[model samples]
Target: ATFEIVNRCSYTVWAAASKGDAALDAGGRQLNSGESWTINVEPGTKGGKIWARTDCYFDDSGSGICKTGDCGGLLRCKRFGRPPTTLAEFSLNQYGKDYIDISNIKGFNVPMDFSPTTRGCRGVRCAADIVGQCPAKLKAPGGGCNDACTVFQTSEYCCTTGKCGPTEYSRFFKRLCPDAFSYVLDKPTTVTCPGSSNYRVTFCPTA
Candidate 1:
């Protein structure tokens, strides 16, 4: 499987992906508006995740912190990015099918779409004005919106015990992006596709 990650935002974005300890796109790549990067994913890869980082600055050594989606301050991430992130997650060839989803479980940053390039697979997106309409308490620093769990860190929002329900905040996200994961336990978000299908992940996407 492969992922073509595009940036449609007017500003620069750094694309990042992770599958276990391995990093794709050499960990990160800077994409100007209208630019994109493609990653070839291995078959049978599990828990793959992709996202974009904004307002970042890095030296030659590839070290910097992004206002959002900073992964341990490394331009080439060795870990998952911090939330209030919009994610494109998938598992290739899982049980003979590819599982994919757009996730807001960490919260929202840029509007995004996750879809297969191959036919017969449904696409999912979250393009709501989450940042602009973010609640004061859930507004992240610099930019983007935060999940209640990030701000409150309580079981109600975090679902720390693996048993919890949605709150007003989760509802806010779910209402906007019903096809994405609004919270940790959110079901009905995953979509299956035929194995070996390539996918597209667009940032700041329309429709």
Candidate 2:
């Protein structure tokens, strides 16, 4: 499988991915505005996630913290990053099909879209300006918008104990990006495509 990672944001974004123990693109690749990188997945890759880290200043050793999405302060991420980040998630050749989605359960740092570049499958986009629409209580120290779960850590938002549904905070996210995983228990948001289909994950994408 292949992934074409694109950055259309006005500022630079460092893309990161986690698939098993493999750190795609050396775990991260700095992308200036209009820049892009393509990655070919190893066969049978699964449980994949891709995202962008912003406002980063890494030294030669690739060690630094990003305002958002900082993964152990290493440019080459070996673990999942902190949230208030947009995510492009996928699974390759799983059960003879590919599954993909855009998630905001952790919140939004940038607008993004995930599309199949070589198949007839539909695309998933979460391109609303969430940062601007964010409520003050749910806003992060950085410009990213934090999820209610991260902010409140309540059973209502985190759904840690019992059955739960959408709340005012989650509704706020769902209203802006209907196709994304607004909360942990969000409705069906995953998309499936034929095996071997290549994909494009774009950050700060517009209509």
Candidate 3:
């Protein structure tokens, strides 16, 4: 229903929210340290995703890229971010519950917290220090960590069949972030909050 984005990172970040079918940009904001943005997404905007961009450089024409979470090099995005980006995926007001998760299934760039403000709805997080500690083989170019699916590119790692479960690689992420999805088939990470409940997202809260 809404997103209360808190950018508590020591550095600046460009945040984005996208739902594929939307014509206009669903959400995008430039946030400095200690800044916040409360966005009221349009109703019927289910299946939308939210993430942050780092190491970005965009000119006035909005033509540039980011080391993490590039969205077609645009200043505003209506699509998903590229790999090595932390993701908050959600389907709001669906089937009497709002499904949400902080996913490293695609990969992880930034630490995040997605907390429900309503009663009976617990929060979730993926706030591990993954950059410098990323497995040598799974380290992304420049920086950030890559998921097994991004590195292996196989059905086993991708969980396309929904039969495969966590491996040593996925387990690595899950061990660090118990509340996040480490692989495509991660079930324990899924969360069901009360539909239409207010939510707050904080970036680098412990930093």
Best-matching candidate per TM-score = 1
RMSD of 2: 1.4
Off by over 4 Å in 3: 23-26
At residue 72, give the lDDT of candidate 1.
Answer: 90
Q: Worst lDDT window (10 residues) for model 1?
A: 19-28
User: lDDT for every model?
Assistant: 0.88, 0.88, 0.82
TM-scores of all candidate predictions against the true structure: 0.96, 0.95, 0.93
lDDT digits (tens) for residues 40-107 of candidate 3 = 87655577888889988889877788888888888688678888989887878787788888889888
lDDT assessment of candidate 3? 0.82
Clash number for each model: 0, 0, 0
- Candidate 2 stretches with Cα past 4 Å from truth are 20-22
For candidate 1, the per-residue lDDT at 48 reads 87
lDDT of 1 by residue, 55-103 (tens): 9999999997898999999988878998878888899998789999988
Please give the TM-score that candidate 1 achieves against the real structure.
0.96
Clashing pairs in 2: none
